[PDB]
Design a protein around this motif. Structure first.
Motif, PDB file in Angstrom:
ATOM      1  N   UNK A  39       4.583   9.600  -6.924  1.00  0.00           N
ATOM      2  CA  UNK A  39       4.957   8.442  -7.265  1.00  0.00           C
ATOM      3  C   UNK A  39       4.961   7.440  -6.203  1.00  0.00           C
ATOM      4  N   UNK A  42       1.559   6.054  -6.712  1.00  0.00           N
ATOM      5  CA  UNK A  42       1.406   4.763  -7.403  1.00  0.00           C
ATOM      6  C   UNK A  42       1.817   3.486  -7.216  1.00  0.00           C
ATOM      7  N   UNK A  46       0.068  -0.165  -6.736  1.00  0.00           N
ATOM      8  CA  UNK A  46       0.489  -1.270  -7.268  1.00  0.00           C
ATOM      9  C   UNK A  46       0.670  -2.506  -6.454  1.00  0.00           C
ATOM     10  N   UNK A  50      -1.480  -6.057  -6.031  1.00  0.00           N
ATOM     11  CA  UNK A  50      -0.909  -7.483  -6.001  1.00  0.00           C
ATOM     12  C   UNK A  50      -1.274  -8.268  -4.963  1.00  0.00           C
ATOM     13  N   UNK A  53      -4.629  -9.741  -5.169  1.00  0.00           N
ATOM     14  CA  UNK A  53      -4.620 -10.856  -5.966  1.00  0.00           C
ATOM     15  C   UNK A  53      -4.103 -12.195  -5.328  1.00  0.00           C
TER      16      UNK A  53
END
Lengths: 57, 160
Positions: A39, A42, A46, A50, A53
């Motif tokens: 977990x 992951x 993410x 982000x 971007x």
């Protein structure tokens, strides 16, 4: 001789029983730890997407 | 717009499995009565893969905009569309080109500011701090007052 050997064999059997139980405990503990690890992985993934971007923009 | 079509196409195979599995895993009940009407965040947490936040925010706001606060079978489809990539994905750039063509049906060499004036006038949206600011900023993306094609081209794109 046979009865003494029986006592010692049961001794060894019980020792291996206890060791195997301890190992199962450690196995399940490492199992929950591994799930937590996945977990965290992951979540980091993410965050990475982000920030990439944002930097591109 | 594309919202209803995306809801319709949710009847599929991958997202059907996703919705069914999500319900079976973390939609069960037997709580203490807190009413997880906001289980949207719970599902975002339990997804294991969070999509782009725009889906989440449009679902959070536009769904039950009347304050229903409840998720239905159709709203389950909406949330699952938010899970997978059932997006219109910027609509059709052909539509953007056609819109800008209709804008320069007067053929100003670019979508004039007064195009935006009349369009906002038709839309009737209140002239806020965002209003006029967006129009001038897009037209003055050069910050020189000259509205060019690519300015509004990129202004309108990325949206559905």
């Amino acid at each position: 001789e046979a009865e003494k050997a029986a006592d010692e064999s049961e001794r060894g059997m019980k020792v291996i029983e206890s060791r195997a139980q301890k190992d199962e405990e450690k196995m399940e503990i490492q199992e929950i730890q591994l799930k937590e690890a996945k977990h965290i992985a992951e979540d980091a993934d993410r965050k990475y997407e982000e920030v990439a971007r944002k930097l591109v923009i | 717009d594309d919202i209803y079509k995306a809801a319709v196409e949710q009847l599929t195979e991958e997202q059907k499995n996703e919705f069914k599995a999500a319900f079976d895993i973390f939609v069960l009940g037997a709580e203490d009565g807190c009413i997880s009407t906001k289980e949207l965040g719970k599902v975002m947490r339990m997804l294991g893969q969070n999509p782009t936040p725009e889906e989440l925010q449009e679902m959070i706001d536009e769904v039950d905009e009347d304050g229903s606060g409840t998720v239905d079978f159709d709203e389950f489809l909406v949330m699952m569309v938010r899970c997978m990539k059932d997006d219109s994905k910027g609509k059709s750039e052909e539509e953007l080109s056609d819109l800008f063509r209709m804008f320069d049906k007067n053929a100003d060499g670019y979508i004039d500011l007064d195009e935006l004036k009349m369009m906002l006038q038709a839309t009737g949206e209140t002239i806020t701090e965002d209003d006029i600011e967006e129009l001038m900023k897009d037209g003055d993306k050069n910050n020189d007052g000259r509205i060019d094609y690519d300015e509004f081209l990129e202004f309108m794109k990325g949206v559905e």
